Subunit: 191 residues, 3 copies
């Protein structure tokens, strides 16, 4: 890892804090999409893509990688990762504070695991998925590529969620889902 | 910070544990409301108000401050606070273990952030609000003064909750609220 | 505590990670039920029972103890336990990462407190209960023996849950329960 890091980025400042926690000395924000090809003339410091949106993040990931940059993982020092878990190396994965990833779980490229999310044993979290703060995946859960799990949501044991699906804020997934879908929780009601 | 701390206080013992975690050597409980004025003859050790109730806490805060005491913040060493976040100095704020406060968030006087609550980037948490264990505020959320967010509750991004409002246990706030209100979740049903 | 530990066990690998975190050097898996009596001829390293099921765990606990083994607690170094809390010594209790147990709470034999669960002040968690990831018990909550609290569930202050009860995933217990029961939350609905 380099002493400096480029961040393609409000998510930018948060990723900057995580980079600094890891021991990066300086962060350089590079938010421009057009003319990105010219950035290849810059020193090859580590790169990170601080975009919460899964589809944009993947697009930028592919463009940055093609320009000769290494897209590192940003992993807060307080994140706990089982030695038997697999976190894809140099794959633009964000792992925020107090995230716990248990034995034999697998985290794929471009995933966001936000603060205090928990990935229990033997889970697979598909590429460019977004696991929001406090969201929890029980044992043997398979989350597809490009999924979104809302704040404080959860997925019960042994369940699969198909690619491209959305689990709402506070929602509890209770059945296997072989087809893409949108799965809603219950909103707070004014009384 | 002084070597000893007065705690105006079951919440008292919990605040004592946090004070000891910070490195305070001794805690002195001072629970009396009547004759509080006489306490001004005591050595001016740091003070904290360990009352979960927002209105009582503010009353005591105002009375203690008028008697020549410094009301410190009690912040567990495991709480993570972005360097760009603002936590009002010496303002009787409680920040419990494993609380995370992200970039550019602001925590006002007398707030309680209970264990494992999360305040995402650019939030404002209004004075004497009570954020319960596991409650999570997404990015750019504005919580009014004197609000209560129940256990495991959450507030979706970019939302404001008006002064003096209550969000129930497990509830998910989904819309802006310009007027005070009470917002309920769904209770566990016996089957 | 011994340098090695026997684990009666996917939960096995997870408990192994916790044992290694505590500083145990080697873990030996001993999953056989029949012929367990013969294990008494083995060196008396510390023992742990890594079974999520409350009734099986108790059965094995009783059998292992009768064979002259010490069943230790496995407590992740990141778990925070108030000095005034009581965690029954050498009682096969599992306390996972980022669990917080506040002042004067009591954790009984054979309990599982899974990752990021919170036990607030003055709680009692009954023997061989299973508190799932993210589940939170407010102040003065009494959880009976052999209870299950689902992922991200919670129990409001001052409530009792009778022996042998189940609180579902995402569910919020709101009333005292003097009789055993099953208490359900709301499932995510496909839209």
């Amino acid at each position: 890892r380099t002493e400096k890091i480029y961040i393609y980025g409000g998510h930018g400042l948060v990723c900057e804090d995580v980079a600094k926690n890891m021991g990066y000395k300086e962060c350089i924000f590079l938010d421009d999409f057009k003319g990105m090809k010219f950035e290849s003339t810059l020193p090859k410091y580590d790169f990170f893509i601080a975009i919460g949106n899964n589809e944009i993040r993947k697009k930028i990931y592919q463009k940055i990688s093609e320009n000769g940059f290494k897209i590192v993982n940003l992993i807060h020092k307080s994140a706990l990762i089982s030695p038997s878990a697999i976190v894809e190396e140099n794959a633009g994965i964000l792992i925020m504070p107090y995230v716990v990833i248990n034995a034999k779980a697998k985290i794929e490229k471009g995933v966001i695991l936000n603060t205090s999310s928990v990935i229990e044993h033997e889970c697979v979290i598909g590429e460019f998925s977004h696991v929001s703060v406090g969201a929890k995946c029980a044992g043997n859960v398979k989350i597809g590529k490009n999924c979104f799990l809302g704040i404080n949501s959860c997925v019960l044991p042994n369940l699969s969620l198909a690619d491209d699906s959305i689990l709402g804020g506070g929602a509890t997934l209770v059945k296997n889902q072989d087809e893409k879908g949108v799965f809603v929780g219950v909103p707070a009601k004014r009384m």
